[PDB]
Every structure is written in C-alpha cells, then in structure tokens.
Amino acid sequence: AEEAERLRREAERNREKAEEQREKAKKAYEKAKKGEASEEHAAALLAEAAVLELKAVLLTLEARRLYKELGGDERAREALEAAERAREAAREAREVAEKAYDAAS
Amino acid sequence: EEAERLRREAERNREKAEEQREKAKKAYEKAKKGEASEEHAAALLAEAAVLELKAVLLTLEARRLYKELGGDERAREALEAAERAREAAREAREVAEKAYDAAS
Amino acid sequence: AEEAERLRREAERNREKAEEQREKAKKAYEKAKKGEASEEHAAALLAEAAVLELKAVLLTLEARRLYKELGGDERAREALEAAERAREAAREAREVAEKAYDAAS
C-alpha cells in the first residue's frame, strides 16, 4: 500500500537522476574536448549511468514482488511502471555516456 | 471500439505528459541559473495538472468499460494504458512543481 | 523481440542526434543576431533536422507494427516510447533550425 507508493517515488527519483546523467553525457559529447581529463570525465558518466541502471533493475525486481503480493493493485502496477521507466532512462543515459567516452578517446 | 478509442486517448495523454516533463525539467535546470520565469513555470504546472486529471478520468472511464465488457482483453488494455498515462502525468506534475518552487 | 531492442536503440540514437542538432541550431540562431550566421549552414541544419524527423516517423510506424505483433510486450512498448521521444526531439530540432534559417536570411 504505502510501500508501493514509496517504491514509486524512489523509482521516479532514480529516473530524474538518469535524465540528469544523460544531459551531462550529451554536453560532454558536444564539447569534444579530447585528452585524459575529458576521457576520465566521460568514464565517470559511464560509471554513474551503469550504477543507475542496476539500481533501477533492483527496484523493478522489488516492484514485481510487490505486484504479485498485492495481486495487481494499481498502486503496485504504477510502481512497477515507474521502475521500468527509470531503467529505460538510465540505460539511455549509459548509451549516451558510451558515445561521449568513445568520442573522447 | 470505445475500448480502442480509450486506449488511443490514453496513449496521447501519456505522450503529452512525456513532453511536459521535459519542458518542466528544462525549466527546473534553468531555475538553478537564476533566470527562470515563475509565470512560465506556473503554466507548465497548470498543464501538467490538467493532464493528470484527464488521465484519472480516463482511468475511471476505462474501469467502467472493463466491468461492462466482463474483462475483455481490449478493455483490460485500455485500462492499463490509462494507468500508465496517469503515472506519466503525475511524474510530469512533480517535475513542474519543482520547477515552479525553484523559480520562486 | 530482438527487433524491438534494435528499434529502441535506433530511436535512442535518433533522439540523441536530434538534441545535438538542436544545440547546433540554437548557436546558429544566436549567431544570426550578431549577423555572423551563414545562410548555407542554417539551411544545412534544417535539412539534417528534417531527415531526423523523417527517420522518426519511420521508427514510430515500425514500432507500431511491432507493438501489434508482439501484443504489448514491454520491449515493444519501450521501442514505441523511444520512437515517440525521437519524434519530438527531431521536431524541436527542426523548429529551431527554421528560426535560425529565417533569421540568417
């Protein structure tokens, strides 16, 4: 009940951190500075994006367990939906960070 | 039909919400630069709240159609679409709230 | 199945390219008010933005077909969602490129 709502809110905060990471990775690509400092920075965006994706994966697993216990409660469905959207956003952020990293090298 | 109409209205609502949250996040990030318009953020908040309410009403319409068709697969799909639209618009409004408060 | 993952990835690359093009066009629009913007560059940005928008129309059509064939599978839902984000990003890119071209002339 309240747990599905807390999970939903957690997934939403994960998703907004991912969108911030994607924007940083985009700016890093647009500003193809080249050099070690730019490579190291692009590596950090890559690493933070991958952490966000796995965290959203864990939230998805949690939402899928809660979704079974609550027998399909709309609150559990909406939390499961937020978790999948967060994973999609973090995976998209990683993909952009990859592009920025491969370009800085 | 009517189930497929509801489904498409829900898909459209969900897409507008995705557009609105992007605008709201743009305004929120700009609000850390100090040049964000409160009035613009107020308009984003107003539109996000409209979409979340429209989604809630679609959900209720879909639930009504679900019991009427006795659990039709199409009816179930319209309901699920309405619930995704609602969650997308709710998240949109949260970002718009943060954008408004930061711009004030 | 694997096609939906492929569609999602292509749509995510489109959306990212459209955001980069939007930034390029915004710089051109600002450089038009200093008079320094070239009409040829703005026309080139407009053509590239329109190509992205055509590719976005194609992806949404393809993701729609896949969504029907896959029966609302989560992977086909994500491909259609990314395609819609690509379509909106390409639209904004083209709108800004039009402003940059109209200002440069």
Author numbering:
A (entry chain A), C (entry chain C): 0 to 104
B (entry chain B): 1 to 104
Quote the paper:
To explore whether peptide-responsive hinges could be turned into protein-responsive hinges, we used inpainting with RoseTTAFold to add two additional helices to a validated effector peptide, resulting in fully structured 3-helix bundles (3hb). For nine of our validated hinges we designed and experimentally characterized these effector proteins using SEC. Hinge-3hb binding was tested qualitatively by SEC and, for hinges which had a corresponding FRET construct, quantitatively with the FRET-labeled variant, and DEER was used in addition to FRET to confirm that 3hb binding caused the same conformational change as effector peptide binding. For two designs, 3hb05 and 3hb12, we obtained crystal structures that agreed well with the design models, indicating that the three-helix bundles are fully structured in isolation. The affinity of 3hb05 to cs074F was similar to the affinity observed for the original peptide cs074B, whereas 3hb21 bound its target hinge cs221F significantly tighter than the original peptide cs221B. The 3hb approach was able to rescue designs for which the peptide alone or the hinge-peptide complex had shown the tendency to form higher-order oligomers.
